[PDB]
Amino acid sequence: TPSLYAPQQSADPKFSRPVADTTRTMTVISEQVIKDQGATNLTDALKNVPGVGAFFAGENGNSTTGDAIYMRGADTSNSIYIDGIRDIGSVSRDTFNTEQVEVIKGPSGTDYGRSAPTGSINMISKQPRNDSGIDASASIGSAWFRRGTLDVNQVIGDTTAVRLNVMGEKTHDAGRDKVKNERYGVAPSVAFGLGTANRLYLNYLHVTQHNTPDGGIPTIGLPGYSAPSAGTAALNHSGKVDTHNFYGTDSDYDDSTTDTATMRFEHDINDNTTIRNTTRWSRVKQDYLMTAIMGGASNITQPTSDVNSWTWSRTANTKDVSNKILTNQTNLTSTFYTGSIGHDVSTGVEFTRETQTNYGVNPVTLPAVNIYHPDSSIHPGGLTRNGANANGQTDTFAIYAFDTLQITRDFELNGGIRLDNYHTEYDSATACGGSGRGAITCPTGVAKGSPVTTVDTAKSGNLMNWKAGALYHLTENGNVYINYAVSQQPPGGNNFALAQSGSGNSANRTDFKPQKANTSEIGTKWQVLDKRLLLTAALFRTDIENEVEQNDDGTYSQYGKKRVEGYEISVAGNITPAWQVIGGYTQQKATIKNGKDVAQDGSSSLPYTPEHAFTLWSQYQATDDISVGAGARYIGSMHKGSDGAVGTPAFTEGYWVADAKLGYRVNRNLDFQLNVYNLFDTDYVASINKSGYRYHPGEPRTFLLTANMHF
Numbered sequence: 111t112p113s114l115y116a117p118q119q120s121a122d123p124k125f126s127r128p129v130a131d132t133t134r135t136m137t138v139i140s141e142q143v144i145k146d147q148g149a150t151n152l153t154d155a156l157k158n159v160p161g162v163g164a165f166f167a168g169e170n171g172n173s174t175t176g177d178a179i180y181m182r183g184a185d186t187s188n189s190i191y192i193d194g195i196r197d198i199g200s201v202s203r204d205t206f207n208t209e210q211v212e213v214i215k216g217p218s219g220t221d222y223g224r225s226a227p228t229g230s231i232n233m234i235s236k237q238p239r240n241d242s243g244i245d246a247s248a249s250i251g252s253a254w255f256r257r258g259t260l261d262v263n264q265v266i267g268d269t270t271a272v273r274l275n276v277m278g279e280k281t282h283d284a285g286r287d288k289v290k291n292e293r294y295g296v297a298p299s300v301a302f303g304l305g306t307a308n309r310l311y312l313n314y315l316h317v318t319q320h321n322t323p324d325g326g327i328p329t330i331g332l333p334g335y336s337a338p339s340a341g342t343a344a345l346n347h348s349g350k351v352d353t354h355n356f357y358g359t360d361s362d363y364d365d366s367t368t369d370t371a372t373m374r375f376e377h378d379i380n381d382n383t384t385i386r387n388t389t390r391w392s393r394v395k396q397d398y399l400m401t402a403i404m405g406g407a408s409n410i411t412q413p414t415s416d417v418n419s420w421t422w423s424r425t426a427n428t429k430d431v432s433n434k435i436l437t438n439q440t441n442l443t444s445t446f447y448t449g450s451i452g453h454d455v456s457t458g459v460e461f462t463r464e465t466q467t468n469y470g471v472n473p474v475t476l477p478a479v480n481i482y483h484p485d486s487s488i489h490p491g492g493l494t495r496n497g498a499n500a501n502g503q504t505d506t507f508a509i510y511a512f513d514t515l516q517i518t519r520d521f522e523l524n525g526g527i528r529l530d531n532y533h534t535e536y537d538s539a540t541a542c543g544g545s546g547r548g549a550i551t552c553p554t555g556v557a558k559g560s561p562v563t564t565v566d567t568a569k570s571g572n573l574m575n576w577k578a579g580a581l582y583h584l585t586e587n588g589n590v591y592i593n594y595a596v597s598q599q600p601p602g603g604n605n606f607a608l609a610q611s612g613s614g615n616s617a618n619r620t621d622f623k624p625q626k627a628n629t630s631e632i633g634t635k636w637q638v639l640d641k642r643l644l645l646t647a648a649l650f651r652t653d654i655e656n657e658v659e660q661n662d663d664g665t666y667s668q669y670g671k672k673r674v675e676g677y678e679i680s681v682a683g684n685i686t687p688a689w690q691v692i693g694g695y696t697q698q699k700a701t702i703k704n705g706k707d708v709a710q711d712g713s714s715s716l717p718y719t720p721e722h723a724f725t726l727w728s729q730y731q732a733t734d735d736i737s738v739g740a741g742a743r744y745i746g747s748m749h750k751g752s753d754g755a756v757g758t759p760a761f762t763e764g765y766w767v768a769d770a771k772l773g774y775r776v777n778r779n780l781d782f783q784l785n786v787y788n789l790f791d792t793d794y795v796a797s798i799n800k801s802g803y804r805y806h807p808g809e810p811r812t813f814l815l816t817a818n819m820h821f
């Protein structure tokens with residue numbers, strides 16, 4: 111029987127073997143784990159994979175929001191898929207309608223097309239079930255947290271059933287003042303022909319969010335903080351700022367809507383061969399007003415020489431954006447023999463249009479903020495569109511073919527080839543007559559504030575990616591594998607932006623090549639204790655090439671090289687019928703092989719990347735009524751990216767977070783849960799910005815009481 115903590119297979123038909131027989135660093139976080147841990151979003155559920163989280167706060171004109179996930183030494187936020195379909199938006203993704211999350215470390219261009227040199231994160235959506243029931247969850251937690259979720263599956267006919275997922279979350283912040291997060295969701299689904307060779311799945315998903323965004327707090331007092339100048343010397347002795355202090359404005363807001371319609375037709379030609387066709391329309395809106403703080407010598411105002419009077423400048427970080435994705439994906443999976451060789455083929459054709467428009471807004475001039483006693487009770491107002499927007503489009507036609515050749519009962523070979531034919535179009539304009547950062551002068555006969563185009567280009571290209579693996583069953587319980595993969599990210603692949611050919615340092619330069627990630631891997635997977643526990647161990651090397659670097663003369667070129675090398679181990683499943691365990695450890699060394707240093711301390715290291723990361727979670731069924739759980743996360747020391755800012759910590763120190771759980775069940779319809787997070791009320795640096803002026807403090811000890819009603 112399969113363990114609830116270790117799902118046996120990926121829901122993606124692109125994966126022709128179970129997790130154990132898959133030649134990849136794959137982790138499947140189930141709905142069961144999320145529910146026991148009290149995880150309600152992607153980031154929290156991703157804590158189940160070591161060295162995966164939002165480790166970077168942003169720059170000075172921009173700050174990171176939502177699931178700004180860093181995995182394997184780089185921002186992987188653009189490589190977040192829902193049902194094997196790209197989902198782009200600096201918004202938090204809720205787990206109210208996801209059955210499982212699939213994480214793969216080590217990219218492959220064959221898997222989902224263009225990607226970050228990290229791997230893939232895939233949120234698998236809830237579909238209508240054969241059985242009927244209702245599931246409810248009411249939650250009350252620390253800092254006025256409230257959560258209500260409903261999961262209704264109802265069978266209508268012999269071959270038709272409906273599914274409805276409802277959600278409501280209204281909360282405050284336990285360790286941050288004025289920060290409020292409100293969201294709700296509806297997810298209706300209808301499936302026809304269940305149990306037959308013909309099936310139609312129709313799904314809709316709507317999420318509205320109204321949040322108060324946080325831009326962090328001053329890094330004063332942290333290890334490695336120095337005063338920026340002799341004039342501001344006092345800052346070396348004044349100490350750390352109160353972690354609760356909110357430096358934003360009472361006008362700060364973060365509003366986002368998510369609308370995704372999906373239509374899947376599945377036809378079983380035979381008990382071996384099946385054809386699928388998925389159509390999806392999706393739109394992610396997001397508009398926010400945020401506050402970034404600056405504390406260089408030129409940003410510090412000294413009214414009375416007493417540090418309690420001293421102020422830091424405020425900089426508005428705005429966003430008015432829409433991400434639209436229209437796609438059609440055809441997939442065919444067949445199992446057949448070619449003599450003594452068994453085949454497991456997965457092939458398909460995908461057509462996609464991705465749109466990103468950043469509606470320009472008027473500059474928001476914010477006043478200075480007191481360092482130790484900030485006043486956020488100010489109203490500079492919301493946003494006003496100025497007509498000067500950025501438009502990005504990407505038309506993508508991909509054709510793939512994957513095969514797992516079962517050579518013997520003990521030997522397996524597997525391959526894959528994909529061709530992505532793309533066309534990206536980019537334009538961006540700025541309102542003229544401005545004063546500050548990148549202000550364009552108004553030409554003749556052009557009235558003030560008029561949009562003046564700065565970029566208006568396009569890029570077309572082909573992307574040939576491939577993969578290869580071999581697996582050998584040592585015992586009936588354990589195997590040994592090898593894998594190699596090619597992944598590419600073309601100019602305009604990262605965020606639709608492009609640059610005019612022959613000039614800058616941009617990877618998005620239309621004359622530039624894509625960034626290639628070559629991944630070598632040797633591993634071992636083992637299914638023990640009646641196949642109820644999965645133990646894994648891999649050695650990896652991800653080489654990144656065609657990175658942009660400056661030549662001896664001012665001019666730039668793609669001679670740069672990076673390497674993310676390491677060791678991976680993982681545990682998932684049941685130890686005994688009452689003992690459940692999920693987790694792993696990673697030793698990942700991410701360095702610059704060729705090129706300029708990116709780390710602040712001039713080391714060859716890559717920033718916002720822990721070298722060592724550990725995550726363990728266990729649950730024991732103490733008695734028939736009492737279940738007890740515990741968790742432990744270690745995130746290592748990380749380098750801050752290089753920057754002109756003086757006296758800002760060049761790095762953040764490592765931290766250990768511990769969690770606990772205890773569940774009591776009354777009858778078989780009602781059960782209670784109590785989750786305590788950050789059990790030792792440990793303080794730490796969750797993330798730091800590029801300049802190094804601001805950091806996000808570690809979430810303090812927080813409680814969560816849940817009522818679980820099942821039918």
Ligand SMILES: CCCCCCCCO[C@@H]1O[C@H](CO)[C@@H](O)[C@H](O)[C@H]1O
Nearest residue numbers: 740768769770788789790791792811
């Ligand atoms: C798994 C063992 C259960 C321990 C229950 C919580 C005990 C930790 O308690 C915390 O310890 C910190 C020092 O470590 C103190 O700074 C905090 O004030 C205190 O709340």
